[PDB]
Structure 1
């Protein structure tokens, strides 16, 4: 009933459960259903320079013949330095958000310049107006991975580090556009039972639900912990895959739908 929804929208508060339930029955349009969102890790990939980025640039150029890619960048070490300065001053999470965004912008600019000669642009602006044309024509765009919350960033329960960073920024774009998948490109095969960099014998985990991660204490391990909650609330992207971008071909296979790293499912 478009009329009962229209009637509730005019006459009730948007907080009214009846209106909320009526809105949930609305049709569900996917804006870019054939596109895939990829995050290129800031700390895990871009901060590693040529030996990490150049092979992934080659994979992206090869992949954009068969896949439509929205390529988001993490921020990494320079954002961590900015957070340490600003948090040491007691500046609130809303102020730090801007700082992390500029680092993600730097990394999108650097990645984008390696791809410019292939026609692939860096896109920005509140509306991301350059995405539809670029995606139709050169099958890929590069964007900065931070969400645009700025001073309206929701703080964590404790501390001033912004809890929604470039994992969330990339995941939410995949969800908003109704993309067919979301692939996180990092520097490890996927999720382990502990940090594989500091843990003697952590066990690789190839598939896990959000609830299983939380029960194992892995909520804030491989992805920003709020991304697990966004994942469970998501309408369109109900799972994600994390892969090792340092291994040639992992991104390519993942784009084709292969199970190559860790698949994290909402349910």
Structure 2
């Protein structure tokens, strides 16, 4: 493998050529924002719950940015589920539903950003490229909407018209693209259980598990979107994620301090 041989393959072969793909895999690996942490604030699990849930998390965010650089993405929630139900009943395809869901995540980012504006944290449309606020100790954080940009080009699921890549996938792909050091999902449960804790009374807590172990036990589609677990196994920079309960006071602060709250999900 050399630069001259990679360039020749890049000019003479199709991008589908296995020899070209193997040579490109040996290229150097640059991390764009290696010191940042990506956090996703749940839409249905947090923001939809109002003041009792959002106000304590705003306080944690303001206190955490003194020592941690943060990229804060927002989920969608029940308003997106209402839009999905209307559009699916009309027979509209997944690409149309993807655009409808992005507007709800934009709503939630705007509400969160107005609570953080007096602390200097802005809402951005390009978080990984918002270099100035992430570099200032006076700011050190940004808020963004978590939906992916696929719009009508959204890849549909095997069955149904619900977009398979939503706010969980959008936030994770940001963390992977910019080479961040940590990805934290903020939900309304302590973590991953052997069954749905809301509809089952004997679910057992799982502190740590790999993606392969989740699939062999029917847990592929539970606390996280099942497509994001497959993205995790293919990732280059972010090889594990953490899911914590945002309704517990200080849980986000303790997770940023390296405490093993919640569930850790590893790619391998």
Q: TM-score range by the shorter chain?
A: over 0.9
Which whole-Å CA distance do the structure 2 matches of 1:39 and 1:126 have between them? 13
Partner of 1:13: helix, strand, or coil? Answer: coil
**Maintained 8 Å contact 1:69/1:135:** no
Which whole-Å CA distance do the structure 1 matches of 2:68 and 2:127 have between them? 25
Aligned residues: 267
**Maintained 8 Å contact 1:120/1:134:** no
What residue is the counterpart of 2:80 in the other structure? 79
Q: Between 124-133 and 165-174, report the one with greater CA deviation.
A: 124-133
Unmatched runs of 5 consecutive residues or more in structure 1: none
Which whole-Å CA distance do the structure 2 matches of 1:227 and 1:135 have between them? 31
Which whole-Å CA distance do the structure 2 matches of 1:126 and 1:256 have between them? 23
Which whole-Å CA distance do the structure 1 matches of 2:107 and 2:208 have between them? 33
Which whole-Å CA distance do the structure 1 matches of 2:262 and 2:65 have between them? 21
Pairwise mapping of residues 136-215 of structure 1 onto structure 2 (< 5 A)?
138-215=139-216
**Maintained 8 Å contact 1:123/1:130:** no
Q: Which runs of 4+ in 1 moved over 4 A?
A: 125-137
Show CA shifts across 1:124-177 (max 9, x none). Answer: 159855676566651100000000000000000001000000000000000001
Show CA shifts across 1:182-226 (max 9, x none). Answer: 000000000001110111110011100000111111111010000
Show CA shifts across 1:27-85 (max 9, x none). Answer: 00000000000000000000000000000000000000000000000000000000000
Unmatched runs of 5 consecutive residues or more in structure 2: none
Q: Between 121-130 and 148-157, report the one with greater CA deviation.
A: 121-130
Q: What CA RMSD, in Å, does the superposition of the two structures yield over aligned residues?
A: 1.5
Which whole-Å CA distance do the structure 2 matches of 1:189 and 1:145 have between them? 22
The 1:131/1:172 distance shift into structure 2, 3 A limit, reads farther
**Maintained 8 Å contact 1:210/1:264:** yes
**Maintained 8 Å contact 2:105/2:146:** yes
Shift of 1:11: 0.7
The 1:123/1:71 distance shift into structure 2, 3 A limit, reads same
Which whole-Å CA distance do the structure 2 matches of 1:127 and 1:236 have between them? 15
**Maintained 8 Å contact 2:134/2:140:** no
TM-score between both structures, scaled by the size of structure 1: 0.97
Which whole-Å CA distance do the structure 2 matches of 1:98 and 1:134 have between them? 32
**Maintained 8 Å contact 2:69/2:134:** no
**Maintained 8 Å contact 2:128/2:174:** no
**Maintained 8 Å contact 2:60/2:250:** yes
**Maintained 8 Å contact 2:33/2:128:** no
